[PDB]
Amino acid sequence: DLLSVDFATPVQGLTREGRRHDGIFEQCIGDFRVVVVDGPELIEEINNPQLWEKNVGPTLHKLRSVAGDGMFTAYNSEENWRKAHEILTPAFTKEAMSTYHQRIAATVRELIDAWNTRAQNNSWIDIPAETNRLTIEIISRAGFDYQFNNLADHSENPFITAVLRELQYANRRTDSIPFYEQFLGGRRRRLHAADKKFIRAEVDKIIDVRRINPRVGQSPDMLDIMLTAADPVTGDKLDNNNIGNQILTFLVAGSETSANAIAFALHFLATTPDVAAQARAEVDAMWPGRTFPDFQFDQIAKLRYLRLVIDEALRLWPVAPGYFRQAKQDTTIGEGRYAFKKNDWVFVNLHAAHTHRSWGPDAAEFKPERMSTENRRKLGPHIYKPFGVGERACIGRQFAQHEMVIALAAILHQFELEPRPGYELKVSETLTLKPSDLQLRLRNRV
Ligand code: HEM
């Protein structure tokens, strides 16, 4: 059996390629050949913490030009991963979320207010871009108490523009990288040098201004803990350069993932009417009336069905489509087949595993009730790890799940969603999975 696969979208191409194999195979996608694992029994062996661990994959290695040794792009051996991980964990717990809840909810209010004017003017809204401006402000204001953009305004901050140009310059493949960019001083290399200094200077200013602020009577946020808490083992705090890396990390690793997940959930809510009705009924019962909901921290986790909507969105389209693992020792997965020497790395294809046949014959359908604890217990071997696995799983899972529910609850409570007729779901692949050309229109529910 011969197959022609288009790897223009890499992860979507690997998933189609994986259906002619038995859960593991090889494939050349771009600058490398990768062992792709998309089988339920094989993946859970790869997710074993005693034998395997996180591998800084190719793209993650290329993001080190932007985020350096931040928690997302640092190697396991680098002392700055363990220090930061044991320092920032208390800043991402459920307890720490209640400290941010007010600022998160206030930032959602700012977006809803801006979307009121667009609903009044009967305007089509580019959903991924708007949701990406929101999650940026959510992380920056709740985490660092810093504001980059006003959501009612459409001028873009120079800092966030430089970070995006710096992300594009990092992913540049070795063939598109000129052999002598380090020497000619072209416009692109010079723009990167200027952008890098401008980004480092802005995060240093955020660090210096806070250092002058004693923050009397206020609970410490993410920036405060990085300037206050020392690592219990080594006794040292995160140095200035690493703190600037964590700020850049939380900005890029937290914004795009959460924004595209919200954009996917908005699409499926605007397309399947029964789900939109059941979710809109759950948020109407929690906050009666059409006044903006008085969000209190405990009410967010009580929205069971809206949580099932986000879970099904993260299953059908995991914005983080996969992760790279490496072998801590010489081991074998499966049944003794497939041997791996220490430091050999594979790719866990979550998009293929989440849509795998083990999720039932209706794995391609958006059905939130599937993600209940009882409905999933009736499945057996199946993978659902949208936030990774192990000690290097997503530190911001509780943060993302909190902001994704408040954002969706406010939108469903205040607006109704009109999809674009004739449009069909196309998913582009950047650092994350994103709905391309997704446009919705809103009317105030009155
Ligand atoms: C829908 C939302 C999100 C999804 C699906 C997601 C997904 C993931 C995944 C799959 C990983 C593991 C990467 C790997 O194994 O190579 C990860 C790690 C990480 N995430 Fe996210 N994430 C989300 C939101 C956030 C947010 C809001 C933050 C805020 C700070 C964040 C910060 C991080 C960090 C720092 C790591 C690295 C942790 C470590 O390696 O020690 N993420 N995330």
Ligand SMILES: C[As](C)(=O)[O-]
């Ligand atoms: C380079 As490593 C083994 O610390 O991911």
